[PDB]
Amino acid sequence: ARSITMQQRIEFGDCDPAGIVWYPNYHRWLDAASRNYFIKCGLPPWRQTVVERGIVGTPIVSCNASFVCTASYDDVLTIETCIKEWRRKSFVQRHSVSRTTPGGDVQLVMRADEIRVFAMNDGERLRAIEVPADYIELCS
Amino acid sequence: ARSITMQQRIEFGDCDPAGIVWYPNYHRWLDAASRNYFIKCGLPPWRQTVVERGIVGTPIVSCNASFVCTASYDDVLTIETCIKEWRRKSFVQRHSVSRTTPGGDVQLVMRADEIRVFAMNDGERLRAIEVPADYIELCS
Amino acid sequence: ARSITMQQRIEFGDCDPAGIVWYPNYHRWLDAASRNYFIKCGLPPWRQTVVERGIVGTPIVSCNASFVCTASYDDVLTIETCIKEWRRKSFVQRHSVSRTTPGGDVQLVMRADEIRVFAMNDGERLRAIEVPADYIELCS
Amino acid sequence: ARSITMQQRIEFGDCDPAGIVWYPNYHRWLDAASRNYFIKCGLPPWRQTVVERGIVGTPIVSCNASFVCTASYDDVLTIETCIKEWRRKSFVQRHSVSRTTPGGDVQLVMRADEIRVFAMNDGERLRAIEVPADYIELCS
Ligand SMILES: CC(C)(COP(=O)(O)OP(=O)(O)OC[C@H]1O[C@@H](n2cnc3c(N)ncnc32)[C@H](O)[C@@H]1OP(=O)(O)O)[C@@H](O)C(=O)NCCC(=O)NCCSCc1ccc(O)cc1
Ligand SMILES: CC(C)(COP(=O)(O)OP(=O)(O)OC[C@H]1O[C@@H](n2cnc3c(N)ncnc32)[C@H](O)[C@@H]1OP(=O)(O)O)[C@@H](O)C(=O)NCCC(=O)NCCSCc1ccc(O)cc1
Ligand SMILES: CC(C)(COP(=O)(O)OP(=O)(O)OC[C@H]1O[C@@H](n2cnc3c(N)ncnc32)[C@H](O)[C@@H]1OP(=O)(O)O)[C@@H](O)C(=O)NCCC(=O)NCCSCc1ccc(O)cc1
Ligand SMILES: CC(C)(COP(=O)(O)OP(=O)(O)OC[C@H]1O[C@@H](n2cnc3c(N)ncnc32)[C@H](O)[C@@H]1OP(=O)(O)O)[C@@H](O)C(=O)NCCC(=O)NCCSCc1ccc(O)cc1
Questions:
Q1: A84 and which of A94, B38, C11, D47 could share a cystine (Cβ 3.0–4.6 Å)?
Q2: Burial class (CB within 10 angstroms; exposed 0-12, middle 13-18, buried 19+) of C128
Q3: Is residue A59 a known part of a binding site?
Q4: Which residue, among C65, C95, C64, C101, has the nearest Cα to C80 in the 3D structure?
Q5: Nearest residue (CA) to ligand 1, atom 13
Q6: Distance, CA B113 to ligand 2 centroid (Å)?
Q7: Could you tell me if the CB of D1 is within 6 A of ligand 3?
Q8: Which UniProt keywords apply (chains A, B, C, D)?
Q9: From the CA of D66, how many Å to the nearest CA of chain C?
Q10: Cβ separation of C63 and D62 shorter than 8 Å?
């Protein structure tokens, strides 16, 4: 579908003693790529959607990920994000992460399908909402 | 199978603007719970296994997670980890994360199945190895 | 002054390729130790103080830190926090971080003096407030 | 002195419940800016210096920081780093962090002076070394 791309440089601190990117760092980047996608497609930042419509963001409900090869500091990641499927109150966001060998080869580092929802905070309780029509059209 | 339990207190900084735990923090805890399991079952720390046998740790290759309810600063998480299945060069580590209502009810926060492998660093190249027999027996 | 102590276990992911704790992790722990101090001294969590009195927390305004020796995964940190001085709208929180050799020797890892303030969010603008008298008495 | 500039976009996950950047995130960026400076001045990555000369990186020994105004997700940071003073086995790296109002005004967010050293790992023991002459000339 409608795909957005973003780059992310791996820093020394993003790596573990094993010398490679420590996994939960991938989830930080995927979360940034997730929101970037929305931004880039025109939605306002949560700061604003929360004022205007109660939308605090798009919390994750499910994830399937696979880590194909390692990455390390200085490698520069290219992330590809698109919405793979709209559902009632959820949506599947797909991300492909790769890096580029100096051979100009594009190695797949990781991939992940995130199931998220648009949510509101009903006081202390988080609540999912019907995907907003406006949102679907924007991201379309 | 053989299950280990660990607690984790959520800090203010572990939360996002939405007031709840920011997801990639769960992966940090799951990674700590993963190693804790091994430690608690008797294996030496990677620092040592890398010297003795080249084993740098247990990198993740795949993950399936589901986020059932929200959690926030001050909540105290209880994580349950066990190895669900041994395979040839991989293993499935299962984690269940919950928190306790003051009603003494144990709410499930999240769950996740991690597919990991024992690996070595062959110079700059990460390589999986056959699950060590000794390891299986220890964790058994 | 009134001192609170807390322990913190270093995880593999808290370390960098150099094999030691990556510094910004110390600041996460100091921030947890900062709030823990307040909690432990009786104040309500920010979640509540923000409702009751607008107090969103105690943002940092200044810091002086020194890193005395290294620490790594599995080391267990003991943090000592106290308020070194109350000022008008600020306060100096001091932390001492150490670890224990197996010789039972208590090595100093790091130390840091944090200057923080009680703050409110006046809409999008963060604002410091006069240290609350009640707070001084509680922490005293 | 010789100054390098870098940009850093603040992500939603870099913020706390208070809606602003959680401080230890500044230290991650300063650490990236620190190494970026060296890279940009021509030194090889630690991965390589450790092979060639044992240099594992530039651990921090001391820091003085001041947080002038708040920053939040979507703000884009501009970091300015330079070496303020060479010493025997240490060096003072200075960073200035700012953001740009839409008025085109450049607000100072934070500043920090980091005292670091070039270090080697003598087995499990970290050791500082005399600033390498070559390094001084490169960064000069
Ligand atoms: C999100 C929430 C409140 C939704 O529960 P709910 O309001 O009762 O509504 P619901 O059960 O119908 O779920 C909404 C939709 O998501 C779908 N969904 C929910 N769980 C799953 C799952 N495990 N797998 C697939 N789809 C799912 C539901 O089927 C439903 O579907 P529909 O299209 O058929 O209508 C509940 O799942 C929850 O709290 N999960 C925990 C969320 C969380 O804490 N994730 C970790 C932090 S994410 C941080 C973050 C926040 C904002 C951002 O901008 C980015 C990151
Ligand atoms: C791990 C490595 C090198 C293995 O590739 P390989 O050496 O060619 O061997 P391999 O393909 O046979 O895989 C080994 C086993 O894992 C299984 N496996 C590998 N990928 C998957 C997958 N996507 N789903 C399920 N099982 C998988 C393989 O089937 C194989 O199975 P077997 O039992 O049937 O023999 C390759 O998958 C890789 O580099 N993945 C990237 C790993 C990574 O960077 N994860 C992110 C960082 S994790 C940080 C960390 C490090 C140490 C720790 O202690 C903790 C955290
Ligand atoms: C905090 C705030 C709004 C205060 O500015 P203000 O409202 O105009 O008031 P102010 O200038 O009088 O400062 C209040 C007091 O702090 C003292 N102070 C402020 N800056 C400094 C400094 N650099 N060195 C020493 N003391 C300082 C001031 O002198 C003043 O003192 P006083 O006792 O003599 O009355 C302004 O400094 C600021 O925004 N700094 C940025 C704060 C920030 O973003 N830090 C990074 C994130 S911390 C995340 C966090 C949040 C909540 C938590 O529970 C924990 C962590
Ligand atoms: C770094 C090390 C081993 C140096 O101790 P040492 O080998 O006995 O040598 P030393 O005492 O002469 O210190 C070397 C120079 O730094 C200066 N220095 C050391 N401590 C301080 C301090 N508190 N304030 C100012 N300068 C200092 C020393 O005076 C000395 O100066 P010199 O120019 O007059 O000769 C010891 O301070 C230490 O382990 N500190 C802990 C370091 C640490 O764990 N920081 C947290 C993690 S940083 C992670 C990181 C790693 C690599 C990177 O690329 C980036 C981040």
A1: A94
A2: middle
A3: yes
A4: C95
A5: A128
A6: 14
A7: no
A8: Hydrolase
A9: 4
A10: no
**Nearest of D22, C94, C130 to residue B21 by alpha carbon:** D22
D46 to A11: CB separation less than 8 angstroms, yes or no: no
Q: Is C16 a catalytic residue?
A: yes
Looking at the complex, report in whole angstroms how far the Cα of residue B70 sits from the nearest Cα belonging to chain D. 14
- Is the minimum distance from the CB of D127 to ligand 4 under 6 angstroms? yes
Give the per-residue SS3 of chain A.
Answer: CCEEEEEEECCHHHECCCCCECCHHHHHHHHHHHHHHHHHCCCCCHHHHHHHCCEEECCEEEEEEEECCCCCCCCEEEEEEEEEEECCCCEEEEEEEEEECCCCCEEEEEEEEEEECEEEEECCEEEEECCCHHHHHHHC
User: How far is it, in rounded angstroms, from Cα A21 to Cα A14?
Assistant: 6
Q: Which of D15, D16, D21 to mutate to test the interface with B (most CBs of B within 10 A)?
A: D16
Rounded to whole angstroms, how far apart are CA atoms B86 and B131? Answer: 8
Cα B86 to Cα B31, B57, B62, B135, C33, distances in angstroms:
18, 16, 14, 11, 40
Cβ–Cβ pairs < 8 A, chains A and B: 78
Residue of chain B with shortest Cα separation from D16 = B16
**Resolution for this experimental structure (Å):** 1.8
Q: Which of D73, D74, D68 has its CA nearest to residue D95?
A: D68
Name the phi and psi angles at B13, rounded to 5.
-70, -15
Show the domains of chain B with their CATH numbers.
1-140 (3.10.129.10)
Q: What is the arrangement of strands in the sheet containing C3-9, beginning at the earlier edge strand?
A: C3-9, C76-86, C91-100, C106-116, C60-67, D60-67, D106-116, D91-100, D76-86, D3-9
Residue B31 backbone phi and psi in degrees, to 5:
-70, -35
C-alpha A91: how far from chain center: 12
Alpha-carbon distance of D108 to D96, in angstroms, equals 8
Write out the residues of chain B at the interface with chain D, using a CB-CB cutoff of 8 A: 12-13, 15-17, 19, 22, 24, 72-73
Taking the CA of residue D63 as centre, how many other CA atoms within 13 Å lie in the half-sphere pointing to its CB? Answer: 29
Inspect the interface and report whether the beta carbons of B32 and C45 lie closer than 8 Å: no
